[PDB]
Scaffold this motif. Structure first.
Motif, PDB file in Angstrom:
ATOM      1  N   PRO A  76       0.794  -1.239   0.000  1.00  0.00           N
ATOM      2  CA  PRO A  76       0.000   0.000   0.000  1.00  0.00           C
ATOM      3  C   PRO A  76       0.823   1.284   0.000  1.00  0.00           C
ATOM      4  N   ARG A  77       1.684   1.472   1.006  1.00  0.00           N
ATOM      5  CA  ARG A  77       2.418   2.723   1.141  1.00  0.00           C
ATOM      6  C   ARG A  77       3.582   2.757   0.130  1.00  0.00           C
ATOM      7  N   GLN A  78       4.006   1.624  -0.413  1.00  0.00           N
ATOM      8  CA  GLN A  78       5.137   1.690  -1.337  1.00  0.00           C
ATOM      9  C   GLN A  78       4.681   1.741  -2.785  1.00  0.00           C
ATOM     10  N   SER A  79       3.637   2.518  -3.055  1.00  0.00           N
ATOM     11  CA  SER A  79       2.977   2.477  -4.345  1.00  0.00           C
ATOM     12  C   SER A  79       2.717   3.884  -4.862  1.00  0.00           C
ATOM     13  N   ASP A  80       2.687   4.003  -6.187  1.00  0.00           N
ATOM     14  CA  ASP A  80       2.401   5.261  -6.866  1.00  0.00           C
ATOM     15  C   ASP A  80       1.085   5.230  -7.622  1.00  0.00           C
ATOM     16  N   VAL A  81       0.905   4.266  -8.518  1.00  0.00           N
ATOM     17  CA  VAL A  81      -0.296   4.156  -9.333  1.00  0.00           C
ATOM     18  C   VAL A  81      -1.133   2.999  -8.809  1.00  0.00           C
ATOM     19  N   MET A  82      -2.427   3.238  -8.628  1.00  0.00           N
ATOM     20  CA  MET A  82      -3.349   2.194  -8.198  1.00  0.00           C
ATOM     21  C   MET A  82      -4.160   1.774  -9.416  1.00  0.00           C
ATOM     22  N   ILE A  83      -3.893   0.570  -9.916  1.00  0.00           N
ATOM     23  CA  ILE A  83      -4.601   0.061 -11.083  1.00  0.00           C
ATOM     24  C   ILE A  83      -5.929  -0.507 -10.591  1.00  0.00           C
ATOM     25  N   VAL A  84      -7.017   0.216 -10.842  1.00  0.00           N
ATOM     26  CA  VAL A  84      -8.339  -0.280 -10.484  1.00  0.00           C
ATOM     27  C   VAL A  84      -8.782  -1.242 -11.576  1.00  0.00           C
ATOM     28  N   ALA A  85      -8.661  -2.536 -11.304  1.00  0.00           N
ATOM     29  CA  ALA A  85      -8.995  -3.582 -12.263  1.00  0.00           C
ATOM     30  C   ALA A  85     -10.141  -4.406 -11.695  1.00  0.00           C
ATOM     31  N   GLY A  86     -11.223  -4.512 -12.450  1.00  0.00           N
ATOM     32  CA  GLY A  86     -12.351  -5.339 -12.075  1.00  0.00           C
ATOM     33  C   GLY A  86     -13.585  -4.517 -11.755  1.00  0.00           C
ATOM     34  N   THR A  87     -14.669  -5.245 -11.496  1.00  0.00           N
ATOM     35  CA  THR A  87     -15.919  -4.611 -11.110  1.00  0.00           C
ATOM     36  C   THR A  87     -15.780  -3.969  -9.736  1.00  0.00           C
ATOM     37  N   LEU A  88     -16.212  -2.716  -9.633  1.00  0.00           N
ATOM     38  CA  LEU A  88     -16.141  -1.960  -8.389  1.00  0.00           C
ATOM     39  C   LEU A  88     -17.536  -1.902  -7.781  1.00  0.00           C
ATOM     40  N   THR A  89     -17.808  -2.790  -6.835  1.00  0.00           N
ATOM     41  CA  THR A  89     -19.092  -2.802  -6.157  1.00  0.00           C
ATOM     42  C   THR A  89     -19.060  -1.883  -4.942  1.00  0.00           C
ATOM     43  N   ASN A  90     -20.249  -1.462  -4.507  1.00  0.00           N
ATOM     44  CA  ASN A  90     -20.347  -0.625  -3.318  1.00  0.00           C
ATOM     45  C   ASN A  90     -19.842  -1.340  -2.075  1.00  0.00           C
ATOM     46  N   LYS A  91     -19.781  -2.672  -2.109  1.00  0.00           N
ATOM     47  CA  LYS A  91     -19.160  -3.416  -1.021  1.00  0.00           C
ATOM     48  C   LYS A  91     -17.728  -2.952  -0.797  1.00  0.00           C
ATOM     49  N   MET A  92     -16.974  -2.778  -1.878  1.00  0.00           N
ATOM     50  CA  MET A  92     -15.598  -2.312  -1.824  1.00  0.00           C
ATOM     51  C   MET A  92     -15.476  -0.800  -1.949  1.00  0.00           C
ATOM     52  N   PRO A 151     -16.116   1.972   0.049  1.00  0.00           N
ATOM     53  CA  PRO A 151     -15.378   2.769   1.039  1.00  0.00           C
ATOM     54  C   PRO A 151     -13.971   2.259   1.270  1.00  0.00           C
ATOM     55  N   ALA A 152     -13.733   0.962   1.065  1.00  0.00           N
ATOM     56  CA  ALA A 152     -12.401   0.412   1.283  1.00  0.00           C
ATOM     57  C   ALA A 152     -11.395   0.988   0.294  1.00  0.00           C
ATOM     58  N   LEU A 153     -11.795   1.157  -0.967  1.00  0.00           N
ATOM     59  CA  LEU A 153     -10.866   1.702  -1.951  1.00  0.00           C
ATOM     60  C   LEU A 153     -10.628   3.188  -1.716  1.00  0.00           C
ATOM     61  N   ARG A 154     -11.683   3.934  -1.382  1.00  0.00           N
ATOM     62  CA  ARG A 154     -11.521   5.368  -1.167  1.00  0.00           C
ATOM     63  C   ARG A 154     -10.624   5.647   0.031  1.00  0.00           C
ATOM     64  N   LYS A 155     -10.749   4.852   1.096  1.00  0.00           N
ATOM     65  CA  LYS A 155      -9.812   4.989   2.204  1.00  0.00           C
ATOM     66  C   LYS A 155      -8.400   4.613   1.767  1.00  0.00           C
ATOM     67  N   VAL A 156      -8.272   3.624   0.878  1.00  0.00           N
ATOM     68  CA  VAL A 156      -6.957   3.257   0.361  1.00  0.00           C
ATOM     69  C   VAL A 156      -6.387   4.382  -0.492  1.00  0.00           C
ATOM     70  N   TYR A 157      -7.210   4.950  -1.378  1.00  0.00           N
ATOM     71  CA  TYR A 157      -6.747   6.050  -2.219  1.00  0.00           C
ATOM     72  C   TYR A 157      -6.294   7.231  -1.372  1.00  0.00           C
ATOM     73  N   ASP A 158      -6.953   7.450  -0.233  1.00  0.00           N
ATOM     74  CA  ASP A 158      -6.518   8.494   0.688  1.00  0.00           C
ATOM     75  C   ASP A 158      -5.120   8.199   1.222  1.00  0.00           C
ATOM     76  N   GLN A 159      -4.858   6.941   1.579  1.00  0.00           N
ATOM     77  CA  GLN A 159      -3.555   6.581   2.126  1.00  0.00           C
ATOM     78  C   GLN A 159      -2.450   6.564   1.078  1.00  0.00           C
ATOM     79  N   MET A 160      -2.787   6.584  -0.203  1.00  0.00           N
ATOM     80  CA  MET A 160      -1.758   6.551  -1.235  1.00  0.00           C
ATOM     81  C   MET A 160      -1.061   7.903  -1.306  1.00  0.00           C
ATOM     82  N   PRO A 161       0.245   7.974  -1.059  1.00  0.00           N
ATOM     83  CA  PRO A 161       0.917   9.277  -1.023  1.00  0.00           C
ATOM     84  C   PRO A 161       1.040   9.898  -2.404  1.00  0.00           C
TER      85      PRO A 161
END
Ligand SMILES: CCCCCCCCCCCCCCCCCC(=O)OC[C@H](COP(=O)([O-])OCC[N+](C)(C)C)OC(=O)CCCCCCCCCCCCCCCCC
Ligand SMILES: CCCCCCCCCCCCCCCCCC(=O)OC[C@H](COP(=O)([O-])OCC[N+](C)(C)C)OC(=O)CCCCCCCCCCCCCCCCC
Ligand code: SF4
Ligand code: SF4
Ligand code: SF4
Lengths: 49, 155, 45, 293, 88, 176
Positions: free
Chosen positions: B56-72, B74-84
């Motif tokens: 997570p923290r050692q990353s620059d580009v987050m490749i969003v691959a696959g279907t993005l359901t509402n289940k995931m 808030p988890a991705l948005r919190k992850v995108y926040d943590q991405m420096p």
């Protein structure tokens, strides 16, 4: 003796890309250096192997 | 002239930023296992040099691959926040791009755009390995043409 | 013209191995131990 | 000019720390049918520059629940240690010929556990807390095998003076007398080893461990007049070891903790004791006790 | 003079690197005690290389062996009575 | 017909136990692991240079879509609307109109490229081979609006990708 031929075949490989400038061009522009037979030319300069 | 110096420093900095990405991959659906197929020897997405996991923290580009359901959602948005910063995301596949084959489903947000801002839209269902690697190259050129230091001096 | 589709050669096809081909390589268990002391005894000498 | 000699060591080691990473990725690459970094510069020669200056331009995010004081001194120690044990290495002639170099190497290398312990505590996360706990217990478990191997190795050497190692080996590589210990030693070295730093800290440990293993078990002949002979031999031996160090990085599934402790305390420690018992009496056994002076 | 000078410059370059880095942009405790007890036993058997050159070497061999026998006994005991086995 | 996968027992003769003790005390199966990857190290890589050369494809490849036209230049589409009905993600939206000449072709043809699934039902649905997917796959973008295609963009691609479409369909119309 195969080391001699292998080291030999890397040299006209350098001559294949013209001179030293040509080899440095392809290495720094493509990171591929192996030469191939010419096949054809489009009207762009996109030279093919 | 200071303008020339800020241009050279701009070129020096982003040349690294266009050659040393680290992708935080979000393995969701068939687009995700297709990515790992790109990191396979046939295509070598590590020769340019971006590590397949990258953490997570050692990353620059987050490749969003696959279907993005509402289940995931808030988890991705919190992850995108943590991405420096500088952080970019490449929406891969029709499902992540606009919804794809499940656009009208009740439990999927139509497009990863509605959750996070995206720099590169690579299309496919699934996109072929190079078709996304080209998209990475497209993001690579997108980094070449930035005026970060130039804008700061202009201000 | 006659029908032409993707068909096997008339002899079918060559044999395809499928069993485990793990190689039987290496010297005997006593042999590794015998040399192991051999190098050691050379070592202290 | 003695200060210049320090920079003539710290920086190239720092570059040496920087530049074997491309070796790692390309060795690890070419191993798995891959190519490794070869598009950025010729054969990835400029890949290390492609990542380092990017990293220093990346903002170092700090956890909200992080003690800044510990979060910044733990890398300080981590780099300070990682570039300190390079100083007493008997490479041609060591910078410091400490008569207790082996002890100094062990005490200061065993101090690296504080950096990871502080990093987990200062980070203050569930992942960081266990990961620090797992890493430290794995580490603090493995000096007892480290110390005994080195102790029992040095009975046939003569002292802890690292420069004396060259005189001891001279005729044959010291592995031929303690090859059961070499595999005992080499395996133990694998497991013992801000975020931008932590690359440098453990990584110099990787090369120096192999540099330390190089002088210890596979010595060379140091001609008094020409020193380049020992330089080439030392570098070549520590390169072969490091390639092996990454040869096994992508050749085994990683150990699990319960086996990791079980492997040492039940299959490594008792055998290490026996070899130490073998190598404490054998110099006495054959009247081949070595001279300390 | 020489020693701390090497230490001083080592941390200083460590200092300058990190400074520009963040300015420019029961079972676990159990074995940890056993390691402690073992580690103190390690220090007892550390001076052996000099002890190998004594004139009373006959009494050294029994004594130096005694530690390793006794140290191994602590491991052997700790193993048998559950203990050293990874607890839960 | 069933085959056991783990029923072998280790013989307790001195030779086999010597093999086992030699196997673990001085590791050999692990060293065999080292030898295998070392042989892999001294082997050619299978990594192609993009975009200097890319992996092989097939004439049946389905990629970026493109409407076509007759040798006269007249469009192939007749707004029969078959592609919209079969389009499994409903990425086809088309509107017809009695064109002034009298051929009465479509007015709107919007492919929602980010809704399509590249299934290839659209091309097989068309009775006049109007809508086909070109072999292109490097048509990424930075904007969502770029992906949403339209009749003009579709026609432009047919004018752009025409050598491939004509040749691929020439190598495939006997197959399908
Ligand atoms: C370029 C340089 C190439 C050579 C580099 C060094 C050697 C490593 C690569 C080759 C590995 C060969 C593996 C092989 O033969 O495997 C089959 C063989 C046989 O494996 P096996 O498991 O089938 O053996 C069956 C027989 N028993 C059970 C009795 C063992 O491998 C070996 O014999 C491995 C022996 C390893 C010995 C390790 C201890 C000594 C270490 C000394 C210091 C070094
Ligand atoms: C006169 C002679 C006097 C001396 C005689 C000495 C005794 C005879 C020789 C004994 C065996 C050889 C010495 C000890 C070796 C280790 C023993 C041991 O515990 O093995 C089993 C151990 C444990 O095996 P295990 O866990 O499967 O089984 C142990 C036994 N039970 C089940 C009861 C626990 O093996 C390992 O730990 C596997 C390797 C772990 C590390 C992974 C990487 C390995 C890399 C190998 C290749 C590189 C080697 C480099 C060598 C150094 C080069 C400089
Ligand atoms: S776009 Fe297609 S391949 Fe990608 S995740 Fe969605 S359904 Fe799967
Ligand atoms: S390939 Fe795309 S446009 Fe064609 S029918 Fe399938 S979903 Fe619709
Ligand atoms: S593209 Fe083909 S199937 Fe679709 S409306 Fe036009 S003619 Fe009909």
């Amino acid at each position: 003796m195969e080391l001699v031929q292998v080291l030999r075949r890397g040299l006209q490989q350098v001559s294949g890309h013209g001179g030293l400038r040509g080899y440095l061009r392809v290495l720094f522009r493509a990171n591929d250096v192996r030469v191939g037979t010419l096949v054809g030319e489009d009207k762009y300069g996109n030279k093919y192997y | 002239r200071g303008e020339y110096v800020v241009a050279k420093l701009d070129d020096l900095v982003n040349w690294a930023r266009r050659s040393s990405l680290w992708p935080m991959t979000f393995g969701l659906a068939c687009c995700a296992v297709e990515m790992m197929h790109m990191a396979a020897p046939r295509y070598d997405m590590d020769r340019f040099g971006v590590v397949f996991r990258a953490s997570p923290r050692q990353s620059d580009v987050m490749i969003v691959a696959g279907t993005l359901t509402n289940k995931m959602a808030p988890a991705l948005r919190k992850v995108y926040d943590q991405m420096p910063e500088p952080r970019y995301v490449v929406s891969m596949g029709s499902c992540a791009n606009g919804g794809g084959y499940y656009h009208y489903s009740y439990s999927v947000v139509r497009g990863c755009d509605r959750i996070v801002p995206v720099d590169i839209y690579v299309p496919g269902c699934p996109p072929t390995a190079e078709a996304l690697l080209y998209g990475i190259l497209q993001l690579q050129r997108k980094i070449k043409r930035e005026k970060r230091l130039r804008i700061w001096y202009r201000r | 013209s006659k029908v032409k589709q993707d068909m096997p050669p008339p002899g079918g096809y060559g044999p395809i191995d499928y069993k485990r081909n793990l190689p039987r390589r290496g010297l005997s268990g006593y042999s590794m131990f015998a040399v192991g002391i051999g190098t050691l005894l050379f070592g202290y000498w | 000019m003695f200060m210049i000699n320090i920079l003539s060591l710290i920086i190239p080691i720092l570059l040496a720390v920087a530049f074997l990473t491309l070796v790692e990725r390309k060795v690890l690459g070419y191993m798995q049918l891959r190519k490794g970094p070869n598009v950025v510069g010729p054969y990835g020669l400029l890949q290390p520059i492609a990542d380092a200056l990017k990293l220093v331009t990346k903002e170092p995010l700090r956890p909200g629940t992080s003690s800044i004081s510990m979060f910044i001194i733990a890398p300080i120690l981590g780099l300070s240690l990682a570039l300190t044990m390079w100083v007493p290495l008997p490479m041609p002639y060591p910078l410091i010929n400490m008569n207790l170099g082996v002890l100094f190497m062990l005490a200061m290398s065993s101090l690296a556990v504080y950096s990871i312990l502080w990093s987990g505590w200062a980070s203050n996360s569930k992942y960081a807390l266990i990961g620090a706990l797992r890493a430290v217990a794995q580490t603090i478990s493995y000096e007892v095998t480290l110390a005994i191997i080195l102790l029992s190795v040095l009975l046939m050497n003569g002292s802890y003076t690292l420069s004396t190692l060259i005189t001891t080996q001279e005729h044959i590589w010291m592995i031929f007398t303690s090859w059961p210990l070499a595999m005992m030693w080499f395996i133990s070295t694998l497991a013992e080893t801000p975020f931008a730093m932590f690359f440098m800290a453990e990584y110099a440990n990787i090369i120096m461990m192999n540099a330390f293993t190089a002088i210890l078990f596979l010595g060379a002949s140091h001609d008094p007049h020409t020193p380049e002979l020992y330089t080439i031999n030392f570098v070549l031996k520590t390169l072969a070891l490091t390639i092996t160090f990454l040869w096994i990085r992508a050749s085994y599934p990683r150990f699990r903790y319960d086996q990791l402790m079980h492997l040492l305390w039940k299959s490594f420690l008792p055998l290490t004791l026996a070899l130490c018992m073998w190598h404490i009496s054998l110099p006495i056994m054959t009247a081949s006790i070595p001279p300390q002076s | 003079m020489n020693i701390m000078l090497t230490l001083l410059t080592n941390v200083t370059l460590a200092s300058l690197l990190v400074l520009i880095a963040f300015w420019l942009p029961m079972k676990f405790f159990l074995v940890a005690i056993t390691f402690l007890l073992f580690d103190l036993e390690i220090a007892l058997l550390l001076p052996l290389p000099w002890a190998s050159q004594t004139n009373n070497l006959k009494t050294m061999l029994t004594m130096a062996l005694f530690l390793l026998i006794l140290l191994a006994a602590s491991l052997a005991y700790e193993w048998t009575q559950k203990g050293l086995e990874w607890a839960e | 017909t069933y085959k056991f996968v783990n029923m072998r027992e280790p013989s307790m003769d001195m030779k086999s136990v010597t093999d086992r003790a030699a196997q673990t005390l001085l590791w050999t199966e692990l060293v065999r692991g080292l030898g295998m990857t070392l042989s892999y190290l001294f082997r050619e890589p299978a990594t192609i240079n993009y975009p200097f050369e890319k992996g092989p494809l097939s004439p049946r490849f389905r990629g970026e879509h493109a409407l076509r036209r007759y040798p006269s230049g007249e469009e192939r589409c007749i707004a029969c609307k078959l592609c919209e009905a079969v389009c499994p993600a409903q990425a086809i939206t088309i509107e017809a109109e009695p064109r002034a000449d009298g051929s009465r072709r479509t007015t709107r043809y919007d492919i929602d490229m980010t809704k399509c699934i590249y299934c290839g039902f659209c091309q097989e649905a068309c009775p006049v081979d109007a809508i086909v997917e070109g072999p292109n796959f490097e048509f990424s973008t930075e904007t969502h609006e770029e992906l949403l295609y339209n009749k003009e963009k579709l026609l432009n691609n047919g004018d752009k990708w025409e050598a491939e479409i004509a040749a691929n369909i020439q190598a495939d119309y006997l197959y399908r």
